[PDB]
Each structure stands twice: as C-alpha cells, then as structure tokens.
C-alpha cells in the first residue's frame, strides 16, 4: 500500500512520570499529496491529541470523520486502572505505534477529508507545542451532563422519526455486544494475570527438578533435568508471549472500539441537539 512509514527511537524528554517521549517517525509515503517521498518527522505525543480534540470538535460542527486515537500519556499513574511502565518502556509505545498505524490507515480512508491540508502539514512537519498538555477543562462535557436532563424528556420526540427505526437495532445490538465484550475483556485480562503465576509455578518446578536431581547418581536423570528445564522454559516463553501480546492488543482494540462507540453516541447526540434546535426554532 502507498502508506509506507517507519516509527523508531522512543527518545525521552527528561525525568518525570507519564509526560512526553519523542518519536522518530520516517514517512516514505506515495500519493503525491505527501510532498517529496522522503520525510522523517520527530513528533512528541500528548500534544497532537489536543489537535485530535480540535478534530473532534471540528467534526462535531461539520460531521466529518476522524481516525483511531493518537493515544497520549498521563496514563501510567492516572486515569487507568492500572498501567505499568516497565511493560510500557518500548512495548506500549509499540501499542501507540499500532494505534497510530490505524490512525494513518483511516486518515487515508477519508481521502477528501484527508485533503484538509492544514492538519496533514501539521502531521508531516515539526512545529511541536510546549509541555502544558496536562490540564482539565472538560466543561463542555459538563454542559453535556447538564443538557442530559433535557435529553431525557425529549428522547421520545426524537424517537418518532424513521431513520432511528433503521438505527436502533444497531443500538440494542451494540449494547449486548459491549456488555459481553467488557465481560470477555475482564476474563481475558484475568488470564493475563493467571499466566504469570503459571509461568512462575512451572519455572520453580524446573528449579525444583534441578534441586531434587541432586544427591543421586542416575545420570540419565541428570540429562533429563538439563533437557526438561530448558524445554519447560521454551513452553513458558511461548505461551507467555502469546498470552500477553495478542490478548492485551485485542483488549486495546475493543477498548478504543468502545471509545469509538461512545463518540458516535455523542455524534447522534449532537444530531439530537441540532434536531431540537430547529424544532424549537420553527416552534418559536
């Protein structure tokens, strides 16, 4: 495919907890809206997720389409229940790279909306914002929580339409789907916890083989120790690498899928708000 990129070098921006890591991002993209076939941008995250939220309010006002999350930081010790940094140190940065690859693919998926060239030049250049990206100003969501009371009394007059008669089957369907995937998410991460004491238990079994194979001269048993401990460690690393990486990736997949579900809930909530805007407009 025409999108050929490369993201390397998790370069830190000093000392702290969950703030900023620079990314060496080399982009060799075709399709000459990309400028010159050879760019290598250095981009720091937790700065263009604010650009993504400008994109969020932008497609709120004009009904456009945004791509998967450019996941930010302030997540290891806050807002997540919980996150670990030694597992993050390169690997959750690779999960950022996966979410960014899905970002790239679906930002190519809206090609006319990809030709909003300001944000494309924002991505393929370096003009990086400063480190003030940790604050709380979600008063817009507070006003949404205020207007939820008007939503709860107007929702029937919303429901008298016909497009939602095409739509609400997907609503109830995705409700039972989100219930059964949040339950399967929890039991999957329970297995991710389970495998760790599995691996420690079988590793200490191999160590106890090495222990109790002492004080004996049945040297075939000694070769059995020396072969069994290492093949146990092969099985250990095998189901260990499967048991983490694909399970927690499918978990991130369903998680930002739930995020996409929540923002499309908010999308037809904005459609609802503009509905009652023209409704009381024509009434008055």
């Amino acid at each position: 495919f025409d999108l050929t990129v490369g993201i390397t070098d998790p370069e830190k921006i000093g000392d702290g907890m969950n703030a900023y890591v620079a990314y060496k991002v080399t982009t060799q993209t075709s399709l000459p809206m990309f400028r010159s076939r050879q760019f290598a941008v250095k981009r720091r995250f937790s700065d263009f997720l604010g650009l993504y939220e400008k994109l969020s309010e932008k497609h709120s006002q004009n009904g456009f389409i945004v791509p998967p999350p450019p996941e930010k930081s302030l997540i290891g010790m806050t807002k997540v229940k919980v996150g670990k940094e030694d597992s993050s140190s390169a690997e959750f940065l690779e999960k950022r790279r996966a979410a960014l690859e899905r970002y790239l693919q679906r930002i190519v998926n809206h090609p006319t909306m990809l030709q909003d060239p300001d944000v494309r030049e924002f991505l393929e250049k370096e003009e990086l914002p400063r480190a003030v990206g940790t604050q709380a100003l979600s008063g817009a969501g507070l006003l949404k929580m205020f207007n939820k009371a008007t939503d709860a009394v107007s929702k029937m007059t919303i429901k008298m339409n016909e497009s939602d008669i095409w739509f609400e089957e997907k609503l109830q369907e995705v409700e039972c789907e989100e219930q059964r995937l949040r339950k399967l998410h929890a039991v999957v991460e329970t297995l991710v916890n389970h495998r760790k004491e599995l691996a420690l238990n079988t590793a200490l079994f191999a160590k106890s083989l090495a222990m109790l194979g002492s004080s004996e001269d049945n040297t075939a048993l000694s070769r059995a120790l020396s072969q069994l401990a290492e093949v146990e460690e092969k099985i250990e690393q095998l189901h260990q690498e499967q048991a983490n990486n694909d399970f927690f990736l499918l978990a991130e997949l369903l998680s930002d899928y739930i995020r996409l579900l929540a923002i499309v809930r908010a999308a037809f909530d904005q459609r609802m708000k503009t509905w009652q805007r023209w409704q009381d407009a024509q009434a008055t």
Binding site: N109, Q227, V231, K234, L238, D246, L253
Partner: protein, 48 residues
C-alpha cells in the same frame, strides 16, 4: 451510514486481525513446537 459501512469494514478488518492471529498462532506453534519435537526426539532415541 456510509461511515457505518466503513466501520463494518473495520469489523471485517479486526476480525481479520484475529484471523491472522490464529494464522500465525497455528504457524509458529506448529513450526516451533514440532521443530523441537523433531530436534529433540533424535536426541531422545536413548539420551534423556
């Protein structure tokens, strides 16, 4: 609704991600597993 068709296409895509997951699962499981089977049975002819 065109975006709805687009994210059923990514339903196909991430279902395909689980499909290629079990594809590489059967692949690397079979090749690595049976590889040390066929590499550790000829030493387990009679050597433990």
């Amino acid at each position: 609704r065109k975006e709805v068709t687009r994210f059923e296409k990514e339903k196909s895509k991430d279902f395909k991600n689980h499909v290629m997951k079990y594809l590489e699962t059967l692949l690397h499981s079979q090749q690595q597993l049976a590889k040390y089977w066929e590499a550790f049975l000829p030493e387990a002819k009679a050597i433990s």
